[PDB]
């Protein structure tokens, strides 16, 4: 029951944590991301 609760809370679909994926470099976000609280950053270097 507890593990099914974990699977329902985090939505562990066939391909990872929903649209979110975790790789070697870091988070890869295949969904929108609206945050309720202020975020922080260090740089924002868009790719050429």
């Amino acid at each position: 029951a507890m593990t099914i609760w974990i699977l329902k809370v985090m939505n562990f679909t066939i391909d990872g944590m929903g649209n979110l994926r975790i790789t070697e470099k870091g988070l890869k976000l295949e969904g929108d991301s609206e945050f309720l609280q202020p975020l922080y950053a260090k740089e924002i270097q868009s790719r050429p």
Binding site: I14, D15, G16, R21, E30, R47
Partner: protein, 48 residues
Amino acid sequence: TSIAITGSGSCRHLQFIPVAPPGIPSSVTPPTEVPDRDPEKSSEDDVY
């Protein structure tokens, strides 16, 4: 003693004093085009 009539301005590619120049410039090497494509991925963790 000598006269040297040379082009400039809009005559950059023109020299008008005959010095008998045999200079034949080479050709620019063709650089391989490098388009960058980032399509989405399903998790390779599906394999494991």
